[PDB]
Amino acid sequence: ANALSLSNELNQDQKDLILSIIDKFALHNVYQLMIKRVKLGFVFDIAPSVNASEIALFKKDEKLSFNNDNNKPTNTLIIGENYDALKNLIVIESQSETVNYDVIYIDPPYNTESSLSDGNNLSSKFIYRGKFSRTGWLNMLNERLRMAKQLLKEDGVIFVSIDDSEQAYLKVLMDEIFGEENFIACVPAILNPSGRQVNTEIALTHEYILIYGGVNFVPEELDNEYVINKLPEIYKNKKRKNTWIFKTIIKGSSFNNKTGNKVLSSILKSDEFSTAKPVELIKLLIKLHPNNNARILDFYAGSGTTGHAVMELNKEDGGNRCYTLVTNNENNIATNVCYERLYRINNGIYTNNESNFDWIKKNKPYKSNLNVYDIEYFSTKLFDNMSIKEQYIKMLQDFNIDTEDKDSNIDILRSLTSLK
Amino acid sequence: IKQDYIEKANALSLSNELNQDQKDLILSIYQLMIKRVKLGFVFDIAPSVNASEIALFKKDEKLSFNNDNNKPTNTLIIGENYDALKNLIVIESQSETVNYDVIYIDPPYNYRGKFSRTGWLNMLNERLRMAKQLLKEDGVIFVSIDDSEQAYLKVLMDEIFGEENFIACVPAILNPSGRQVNTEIALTHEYILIYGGVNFVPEELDNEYVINKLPEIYKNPKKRKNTWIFKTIIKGSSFNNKTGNKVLSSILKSDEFSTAKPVELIKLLIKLHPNNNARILDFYAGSGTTGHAVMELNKEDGGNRCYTLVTNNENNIATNVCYERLYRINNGIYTNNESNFDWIKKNKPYKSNLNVYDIEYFSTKLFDDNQSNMSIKEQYIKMLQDFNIDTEDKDSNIDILRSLTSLKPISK
Ligand SMILES: Nc1ncnc2c1ncn2[C@@H]1O[C@H](C[C@@H](N)CC[C@H](N)C(=O)O)[C@@H](O)[C@H]1O
Ligand SMILES: Nc1ncnc2c1ncn2[C@@H]1O[C@H](C[C@@H](N)CC[C@H](N)C(=O)O)[C@@H](O)[C@H]1O
Known part of the structure; x- marks a missing residue:
């Protein structure tokens, strides 16, 4: 109704028939499928x-x-x-x-091949929800980024790291979700300064970081000392403290792809997981949010780099931020790599109670706490009882919610319909 | 009853383009429903x-x-x-x-309203497809585009030239110290979108040039010469946007054109194409930075390169800004018998050639007029000869009438 008014009348005659479909009718699902056919844009x-x-x-x-x-x-x-x-x-x-x-x-x-190899699917080809290649990959992030928006504060930020293989398509896709007015920047990350051998006889050296703000988010300025030590190539050459406005280029020794990977290898004592982001990269991003007690989320958590990064910043920042991580245990990367890295970083002893990894020899343990959760799936038929309601309340109680005035609802169990 | 026939067609085929749920929504919810959706704009x-x-x-x-x-x-x-x-x-x-x-x-x-008739992206779609027609198999196309609009152009050039042929999206750090636009942030970079037709391989860069011009990026021969493969990052002292603007004002002794690109940037790009004798085209020529760069690269490279420029007289720029630049650089003296501007006191004139053409519009039915049709027919032949065409073919009236029907201007 309102979306059609915003679209106006590029193909209005068809809209009149679409409006008839609402009268006949789980409607928003059919509207989204229609709007794509008639839409004038991406x-x-x-x-x-x-x-x-x-x-x-x-x-x-x-x-x-x-x-x-x-x-x-x-x-x-x-x-x-x-x-x-x-x-x-x-x-x-x-x-x-x-x-x-x-x-x-x-x-x-x-x-698209990387998503299939060790991640979501539905095995010879990448297929998501009956769609192949890019359409799958796009469908995937559209529904997740929609939710991510619902979870972001009005004065919040969302950072996303992409390659050249989907970057332009994601920026267009995110323009729809978060609004083109809120696009902050598309910061290049020179994570491979040496340049990687590429099929087209070129030395791809860079990567992107899409930044989309909440409607009234203003990025915070960087501290001089941090910017001189960490990003010396970008910042070089008078009210309150000495600060720098964030420059839309990330390059420096700390922000290598090899740095983040070597760190993980040193903590995990295993080079099995080969794709980790530089802990310093993420510290820099969360530093752009002024609340130093910020709540950080990362539902593509991988090796837990976001978690380690928040912890490091807290040590340097002097503030207490909490992080939420999500990652499937495909080949245990979630159970093995996330837990091991976060545990060893916190307590200094392996889960097997062995302390031989190089990291703890080099730096001291953070001594923080981490709650681990699983995803248990209950049947809709049994829903349409007492065990579900019981656990839901425990979940809310798990997150420090006063549950004296909260009860299970059909509305809320309808919100948690899982994915096939 | 028509439902029965429609239901039968739905049950007959499904395949990739339709989701089992999509089929369920098509039957549960007809030409609009059966319309196919392409991924793009x-x-x-x-x-x-x-x-x-x-x-x-x-x-x-x-x-x-x-x-x-x-x-x-x-x-x-x-x-x-x-x-x-x-x-x-x-x-x-x-x-x-x-x-x-x-x-x-x-x-x-x-x-x-991009995608609209006069929308920024629509017009670029029309012109890019023609530029696609004007590019050789083993050729390249470079587009400079900003932080915000880079993504829409990239997926468009994906449609027009094909994602198979996407070469790089180079970040050019053309404002080392940032400038705040649209948001409280120091925007420091631009993008260069590189596409090439099949059979094009980028040329490696000379060590000597790479060291002086891009010292920060090419930090520390099996073959014959010292070659660096092109790194997708352009940070240089000579790649400043203010640098290109000072050069242009060094020539024109005027600050009227404020958005001039550095010639060192456009040198690095055309220096990316294998052959020294290359034809360069730039149909958004602005102040003619592309022309200055081809000549300057020729002086450094030793190869003879020809450029073709196109720009309109929006604010008289193409006459005052673009021509004056090219003119004062070739001739070593202002067009009005003067010689006191800075550029020529610091560098030698190129002393090269340049041909200026205007676009004239002639209403149809002027072919009905006998004197005008000949005028149009001769002006067409004069074009070809001006561009070094033999013209033995297409002298006749049939061939001329086929190429004239192909030249129709835009609605104004
Ligand atoms: N549908 C999915 N659900 C949950 N986790 C996923 C899903 N798809 C991918 N992942 C995980 O998300 C993570 C994506 C990683 N590339 C993130 C890397 C992370 N920045 C790091 O420093 O290690 C991987 O651990 C994937 O296994
Ligand atoms: N339809 C058009 N036809 C010809 N030129 C145009 C048209 N639209 C814009 N332009 C010109 O294209 C140029 C685009 C400029 N931004 C390019 C600047 C140029 N690359 C320089 O370094 O000086 C401007 O001079 C515009 O006046």
């Missing part, structure tokens, strides 16, 4: 997000969840499909106070 | 071409000049690049060796 065939029967709730792994200091910020790690986690994350925030996250950072699978 | 109807008018070039003999028959011959066209491109396609079709090795353009960024 277009692709969206696939309808058909809510499966099952429902998704958080179950806390009490053995894996640890807590070293009650005074340190409380942090969260959700293990499972990020589509189900985000549905649960939104329900938690609604029933909660101080709603939504101050910062969002994600490193989604760049390539 | 949908555009409003563009401005119709004038069926009752044609455009032709007409050399300005007073303005065009020649200094050295051994140096390459270059071209400057004044007017709407859409009408200019339509002629250039007719010129190449009748030319012995067809089409350009290098296209560089820096279009304007620009409420504008």
Whole structure:
């Protein structure tokens, strides 16, 4: 109704027939499919997000969840499909106070082949929701980025890291989701200064960081000392403190692709996981948000670099930020790499109670706490009882929500329809 | 009852383009439902071409000049690049060796309903497809574009030239110290979108040049010469946007044109194409930075390169800004018998050639007039000869009538 008024009349006669479909009628799903056909702009065939029967709730792994200091910020790690986690994350925030996250950072699978190899699907080709190649990859992030928006604060930021293989298409896609007026920058990251051998006989040296602000977000200025030590090539040559406006280019020794990977290898004692972001890159991004107690989210958490980064910044910043992570355990990367890295960083002993990894020999343990959650799926038929309601309340209670005045609802269980 | 036939068709085929749920929504919810959706941009109807008018070039003999028959011959066209491109396609079709090795353009960024008729992106769609027609198999096209509009152009050039041929999206750090626009942030970079037709491989860069011009980027021979593969980052002292603006004002002794690109940037790009004798095209020529760069690269490289420029007289720029630049650089003296501007006190004149053409419009039914049809027919032949075409073919009336129907200007 309102969306059609905004679109106006490029093809109005067809709209009159579309308006007839509303009268005949689970409507918004059909409207989105229609609008794509008639739309005048960037277009692709969206696939309808058909809510499966099952429902998704958080179950806390009490053995894996640890807590070293009650005074340190409380942090969260959700293990499972990020589509189900985000549905649960939104329900938690609604029933909660101080709603939504101050910062969002994600490193989604760049390539269409990379997504299939070790991630979501539905095995010879990449197919998502009956769609192949780019349409799949686009459909994927559209529905996740829609939710991510719902979770972002009015004065919040969302950072996204992309390759050249989907960057332009994601910036157009994110323009639709977050609004083209809120596009802040498309910052280049020279993470491979030496240049990687590329099929087209060129030395691809760079990467992007799409920044989209909430409607009234103003980026924070960088501290002189941080900018001189960390980004010496970009900042060189008088009220309050000495600060720098963020320059839309990221390049420096700390911000190498090899740095982030070597760190992980040193903590994990394993080079199995080969794609990690520089911890310093993410510190710089979250530094752009003025609240140094910001709530950071990263539903493509991978090796937990976001978590380690927040912790490092807190040590240097002097403020207490909490992070929420989500990552599926495809080949255990979620269970093995995220937990191991975060555990070893926090306590200095391996899960096998062995302390031989190089990192702890070099630096001291952070001594923070991490809550681990799983995704348990219950049947829609059994929904359409007492066990579901019971666990939902535990989830809310798990996140420090006063549950004396909250009850299970059909509206809320409808919100948590899982993905097939 | 028509439902039964529609239901049968739905049940008959499904396949990739339809999701089982999509089929369920098509039957649960007809030409609109059966319409196919392509991944990319949908555009409003563009401005119709004038069926009752044609455009032709007409050399300005007073303005065009020649200094050295051994140096390459270059071209400057004044007017709407859409009408200019339509002629250039007719010129190449009748030319012995067809089409350009290098296209560089820096279009304007620009409420504008993109995808609309006069929308910034629609007009670029129309002109880019023609430039696609004007590019050789083993050629390149460079477009400079800003932080915000870079993505829409990239997916467009994906449609027009194909994503298979996307080479790089180079960040050019052309404002080392940022400038705040649209938001509280120091915007420091631009993008260069590199596309090439099949059979094009970028040339490696000379160590000596790479070291002086880009020392920050090419930090520390099996073959014959020292070569660096092109890194997708352009940070240099000589790649400043203020640098290109000071050069232009060094020549013109005027600050009237504020958005001049550095010539070192456009040198690095055309220096990316293999052969020294290359044809460069730039149908958004602005102040002619592309022309200055081809000549300067020729002085450094030793190869003879010809450029073709096109720019309109929006604010008289193409006459005052673009021509004066090219003129004062070739001739070593202002056009009005003066010689006191800075550039020529610091560097030698190139002493090269340049031809200036205007775009003239002649209403149809002037063919009905006997004296006008001949005038148009001779002006068409004069074009070809001005661009070094033999003209033995297409002298007849049939061939001329086929190429004149191809040159129709835009609606105004
Ligand atoms: N549908 C999905 N649901 C949950 N996790 C996913 C999904 N798709 C990909 N992932 C994970 O998200 C992470 C994406 C990574 N590229 C992120 C890298 C991360 N920035 C790091 O420093 O390690 C990987 O661990 C993937 O296995
Ligand atoms: N339809 C058009 N036809 C010809 N020129 C145009 C047209 N639209 C814009 N322009 C010109 O294209 C140029 C685009 C400039 N931004 C390019 C600047 C140029 N690259 C320089 O370094 O000086 C401007 O001079 C515009 O006046």
